[PDB]
Nucleic acid binder design. Structure first.
Length: 98
DNA sequence: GGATGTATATATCTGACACGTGCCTGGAGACTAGGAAGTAATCCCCTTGGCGGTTAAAACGCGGGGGACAGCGCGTACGTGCGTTTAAGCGGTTGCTAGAGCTGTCTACGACCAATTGAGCGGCCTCGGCACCGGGATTCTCCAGGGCGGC
């Protein structure tokens, strides 16, 4: 049985997804999440498709930058695995948390 | 002798160039008012190079121990791969409504201007409170007289 060591597939996915440009979250679950979040502010909200796409592109941009700073936090703590405390430290230093 | 590889010619697809048209927005020409450049005066802050004295911060050295880092073990939790499920993605129905765009009318609301005056800025006088000076009441230290002992 052919197997790969743990990590080279991860490097292959890092090289693959840093070359690509499409969105990594599916359209309908993100649209459902947007509509659920929006119905807590105003009832009976319609949505343009480009509004959902702009919200999506902003969301993947924010999460990719957050994961970059999370990886920097994990590397600074002499680790290769990211932890929730790395996300908390990144948001704390960035100023979003506190 | 038959079929296969390859060259040249012809029809078709597709991005790009030029022609046409509207229209509306930018440009040309003229006029005017005020924004800003320039000028003079006054006054206060900043610059550069000094001096003097205080003093607390900065620097230096040294001992020691707390903490950073390296190494090792271990166990668990995440990566990897496969089979199965499931839901995303696409195409589709069917009506109604929201919204952009366009046109039209009108009315209340805000710009604008003149006269007015009352709220904001500065100084002056006074009070509330804190402090300086004079006088009365209370308590502490001291000098002298009386009595006792010794030669």
């Amino acid at each position: 049985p052919h197997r790969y060591r743990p990590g080279t597939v991860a490097l292959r996915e890092i090289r693959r997804y840093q070359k690509s440009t499409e969105l990594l979250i599916r359209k309908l679950p993100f649209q459902r999440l947007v509509r659920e979040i929006a119905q807590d502010f105003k009832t009976d909200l319609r949505f343009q498709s480009s509004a959902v796409m702009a919200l999506q592109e902003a969301s993947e941009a924010y999460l990719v930058a957050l994961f970059e700073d999370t990886n920097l936090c994990a590397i600074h703590a002499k680790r290769v695995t990211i932890m929730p405390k790395d996300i908390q430290l990144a948001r704390r230093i960035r100023g979003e948390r506190a």
